[PDB]
């Protein structure tokens, strides 16, 4: 009968101590040099540095711990990035505390986000299949470890300079287990959220498959369904309406329509799993990284 207070209530020093148990010890400025800022706000800053031992370029996200309003999501995120690694997930090399800052040392990807592509170009089905295959491989791995991303959208998909596709931004992720197999939290970016999450029903890894389907509609039509409406209004339609369809059915192949139909299924138990989707004929259309390069802004 001792009450331990929630992470939002503890001292800044004990928030930091919590993080100290899960980050790498020491000071990364020992092995990193030549920091150049490339992004900012609102919690911190992003820099490119050069590893002194190797000359390798890395990205370092520096976040002010006193500005973190979602302390527990950050804590949970740091553990996931530490423990899970996959070629289609932006890799965290190591994390550290420097004063009141969390330094996250990440792989440096120079190809921008998928959002820039879907808002300015028209992807072909080969290119769509390539993105889907990459994301589904990441999800295959993550879902098998009980990790739910919860925030799949074009904005969170980053590209290497040579056209490889990587899932990023695990700020909203969750980990389920045999003991706690489902989550209940209302988390995500409105237009991409699964109906069961919006209904506040217990949910698992299946929510990422719905969100993926919405991203496929982004890649087809340029925006997710109901993007012209206010987010809370869009959420009501997701929760209560039949699954969204593409604008022009006749301009999407039978195989891609079938793939989409397996993902945008309201009942989670009837929705395809990442494992099942990897065997879908649509993904036999996937190409090499070179097929993505012509889409990129440069």
Q: Is 163 left (phi over 0), alpha (psi -120 to 50) or beta?
A: left
Tell me: is residue 44 an annotated ligand-binding position: yes
Q: Please report how the helices 71-83 and 12-20 are oriented relative to each other, as an axis angle in degrees rounded to 10.
A: 10
Strand extents, DSSP E, 110-259: 147-148, 157-159, 165-167, 174-175
Tell me the residue length of the chain: 298
Nearest to 139 by CA among 152, 126, 130: 152
3-state secondary structure of 122: coil
| Integer Cα distance of 196 and 171 in angstroms | 20
122's CB contacts (< 8 A; 6+ apart) are none
Tell me: is residue 222 an annotated ligand-binding position: no
Most distant CA pair in the chain, distance: 64
Tell me: is residue 171 an annotated ligand-binding position: no
DSSP 285: G
Nearest to 170 by CA among 157, 183, 184, 186: 157
Tokens of 93: 């090399």
CA triplet 56, 92, 38: central angle to 5 degrees?
Answer: 60
Phi, psi (rounded to 5 degrees) for 135: -70, -40
Domains present along the chain, CATH in parentheses? 1-108 (3.30.200.20), 109-298 (1.10.510.10)
Q: Is 151 an active-site residue?
A: yes
Handedness of CA 224, 225, 230, 234 (dihedral sign): negative
| Integer Cα distance of 285 and 129 in angstroms | 6
Return the CA Rg of the chain: 20
Tell me: is residue 43 an annotated ligand-binding position: yes
| Integer Cα distance of 244 and 261 in angstroms | 10
Residue 95 belongs to what H/E stretch?
A: strand 92-98
Give the active site residue among 64, 151, 208, 240.
151
Q: Are 75 and 22 in contact (CB under 8 A)?
A: yes
75's CB contacts (< 8 A; 6+ apart) are 7, 18, 19, 22
Task: Specify burial of residue 262 (Cβ count, 10 A radius: 0-12, 13-18, 19+).
Answer: middle
Tokens of 42: 């609102």
Residue 101 belongs to what H/E stretch?
A: strand 101-107
β-bridge pairing 147-148 and 57-64 = unpaired
What residue has token string 């040579």? 162
């Amino acid at each position: 009968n001792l009450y331990f207070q929630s992470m939002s209530r503890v001292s800044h020093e004990q928030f930091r101590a919590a993080l100290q148990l899960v980050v790498s010890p020491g000071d990364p400025r020992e092995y990193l040099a030549n920091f150049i800022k490339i992004g900012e706000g609102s919690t911190g800053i992003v820099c490119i540095a050069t590893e002194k031992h190797t000359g390798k370029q890395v990205a370092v996200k520096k976040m002010d711990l006193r500005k973190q309003q979602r302390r527990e999501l950050l804590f949970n995120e740091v553990v996931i990035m530490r423990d899970y690694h996959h070629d289609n997930v932006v890799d965290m090399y190591s994390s550290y505390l420097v004063g009141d800052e969390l330094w996250v040392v990440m792989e440096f990807l120079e190809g921008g986000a998928l959002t820039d592509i879907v808002t300015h170009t028209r992807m072909n089905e080969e290119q769509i299949a390539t993105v889907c295959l990459s994301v589904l491989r990441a999800l295959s791995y993550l879902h098998n470890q009980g990790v739910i991303h919860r925030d799949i959208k074009s904005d969170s998909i980053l590209l290497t300079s040579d056209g490889r596709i990587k899932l990023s931004d695990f700020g909203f992720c969750a980990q389920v287990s045999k003991e706690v197999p489902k989550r209940k939290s209302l988390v995500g970016t409105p237009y991409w959220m699964a109906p069961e999450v919006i209904s506040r029903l217990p949910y698992g890894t299946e929510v990422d498959i719905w969100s993926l389907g919405i991203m496929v509609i982004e890649m087809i039509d340029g925006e997710p369904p109901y993007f012209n409406e206010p987010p809370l209004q869009a959420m009501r339609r997701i929760r209560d309406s039949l699954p969204p369809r593409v604008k022009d059915l006749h301009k999407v192949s039978s195989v891609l329509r079938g793939f989409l139909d397996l993902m945008l299924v309201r009942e989670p138990s009837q929705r395809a799993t990442a494992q099942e989707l990897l065997g879908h004929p649509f993904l036999k259309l996937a190409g090499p990284p070179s097929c993505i390069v012509p889409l990129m802004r440069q």
